[PDB]
Each structure stands twice: as structure tokens, then as C-alpha cells.
């Protein structure tokens, strides 16, 4: 079993992770009637999706497969907390790891940690902002919702796209692939909020490799392989972008 694993993660780094991702992205983004519905039905049956919570729970009511993936929910089912002195959970899933960031070193899994700098791609200024702060990491199983929402009111200041590999971010790889979140493709979002600065980072999976924010649409693909970075004003200014506690800020997608 322990080395049954140690050939399952061997399977991970050999297979052309990128090419399969782009192949699966082409398939899920194409117009297929019964095909997608059949694929969707099997998916729903395998990963035990709770279609009741979906805004449109008939598996046929979705055109492509990515549409079923980015399914908007019955807004009546996710209640943003009332207390403006509480920060609300950002996305559906299960908590990977959380706690205090102990001097720039974040716990990945037991026996593995990664630098606040290497995660933020060497932006040591942004890294210096969060030394000895707090963090939280959420794993989004295929069963779960796949759009990302804000924990509190935010004013956008920076956004940074980072290229990288496409390993599976499942727990099996999380306990063996070092600096997984610092290597895999990711997008960083930096806000000002009533509780100091706050960063919310989206990281792709081995075929769930598309990341789109609501304010810029799809960012990857294309996977241009370099770093893009934009800047915003201080809020309540010309060209200022802001969004509230519980708003959709982005989502994951196949491709």
C-alpha cells in the first residue's frame, strides 16, 4: 500500500499533464447533447453531486460540460453570514490546512512547507505584508461547487497570474509533492479590506486548469508561460474595483 502509492504518484509526473488538460478542455467545452448529459449523469453518479442545490437540477438543462461545472447554485442555499465582524468561508469543499503562518513558512501537509515568497512568485513586498499572519487552504473536490466567493468586502489592488505545472492537488499528491501550490499554475488576488490586506489565490488542478475572475474573465488558458500583473487605485477612485462579502470573484474550469 505505501509503495502502491509510490507508483500512483509515479503515474502523476510521467503522463503529459498539460496535453490531457487541453484535451479534456476541448471535450468539455464542446456542444454535445446526450453525450454531455450522459457524461454529466455518470459524473453525478460517481462523485455523488447534490443536484438538488443546483439552480437548474435537470442534467439535460446544461449545454456544454463546463457549464455544468460552473453551475450557479440556488442562491437560497448558501447564506452569507450576518455579523460584519466575521469573515465568511470563501468556497465550498473541505479545509486542507489552516492556522498561523509562522514566519513566512506555511504548512502544506505534515512534513512539507513552502515559502510565502515562492508562493507569491518572489513578490517579497507582498510576502512581507503577510509574515506571521494567518492562512487557510480549501480543497475543492469535483463534487463541490466550483466558483470562488469573497470572505469579506474587498477593494482590488493587485492581481498576478503565475505559470506552472498541472499536478493533481488531491491529498495523495498534497502529502508527497513539495511546494505543490508554489509550482502549479495559479492566480493571486490582493485586496484591501477592513481587516488589513487580504490575499485570495486560485490554483488549478491537473485537468481543472482554467481560472477566471469576474472582473477580467478567463485568464488561463491561454497559458502564455510568463507572469502578468496589473494594478488598481485605492478604492472610491476613477477605475476602482470593489466587491462585497459573499460576491462571486471567480471560478475554476476545465481546460
Amino acid at each position: 500500500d505505501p509503495m502502491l502509492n509510490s507508483f500512483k504518484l509515479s503515474l502523476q509526473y510521467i503522463l503529459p499533464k498539460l496535453w490531457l488538460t487541453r484535451l479534456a478542455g476541448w471535450g468539455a467545452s464542446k456542444r454535445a447533447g446526450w453525450l454531455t448529459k450522459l457524461v454529466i449523469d455518470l459524473f453525478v453518479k460517481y462523485y455523488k453531486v447534490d443536484m438538488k442545490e443546483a439552480q437548474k437540477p435537470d442534467t439535460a438543462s446544461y449545454r456544454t460540460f463546463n457549464e455544468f461545472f460552473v453551475r450557479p447554485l440556488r442562491d437560497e442555499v448558501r447564506p452569507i453570514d450576518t455579523d460584519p465582524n466575521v469573515l465568511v468561508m470563501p468556497a465550498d469543499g473541505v479545509i486542507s490546512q489552516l492556522g498561523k503562518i509562522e514566519e513566512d513558512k506555511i504548512l502544506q501537509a505534515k512534513g512539507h512547507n513552502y515559502s510565502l515568497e515562492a508562493l507569491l512568485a518572489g513578490n517579497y513586498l507582498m510576502a512581507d505584508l503577510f509574515r506571521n499572519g494567518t492562512f487557510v487552504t480549501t480543497y475543492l473536490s469535483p463534487r463541490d461547487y466550483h466558483r470562488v466567493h469573497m470572505p469579506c468586502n474587498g477593494i482590488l489592488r493587485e492581481m498576478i497570474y503565475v505559470p506552472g505545472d498541472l499536478f493533481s492537488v488531491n491529498h495523495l499528491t498534497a502529502q508527497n509533492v513539495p511546494n505543490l501550490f508554489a509550482r502549479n499554475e495559479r492566480v493571486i488576488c490582493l485586496f484591501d479590506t477592513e481587516f488589513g490586506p487580504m490575499a485570495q489565490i486560485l490554483v488549478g488542478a491537473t485537468i481543472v486548469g482554467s481560472i477566471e475572475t469576474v472582473w477580467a474573465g478567463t485568464i488561463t488558458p491561454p497559458r502564455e508561460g510568463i507572469i502578468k500583473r496589473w494594478t488598481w487605485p485605492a478604492g472610491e477612485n476613477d477605475g476602482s474595483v470593489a466587491l462585497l462579502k459573499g460576491q462571486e470573484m471567480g471560478r475554476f474550469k476545465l481546460g
Binding site: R78, P79, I80, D81, D83, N85, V86, L87, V88, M89, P90, A91, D92, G93, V94, I95, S96, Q97, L98, G99, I101, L116, L119, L129, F130, R131, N132, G133, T134, F135, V136, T137, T138, Y139, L140, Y145, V148, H149, P151, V169, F181, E194, F195, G196, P197, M198, A199, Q200, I201, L202, V203, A205, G246
Partner: protein, 34 residues
Amino acid sequence: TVINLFAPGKVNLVEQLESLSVTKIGQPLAVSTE
């Protein structure tokens, strides 16, 4: 997978939360220190 960062002293997360906890959007995650 999503990842969040916060300023050092402005926020305390929920003490009952740990690994493998159930993460649903509308539920609390952290409370201000004010």
C-alpha cells in the same frame, strides 16, 4: 484549491476548525479582533 492570506493581528479563525472540516460558503471562517 483556494488559498487565503491575512494580516498578522487583524483576524482570528475559528478554533473548532481543523483539517478535513466541512467548508461551505455561507458559514463563518474568521472573526475580527476589534
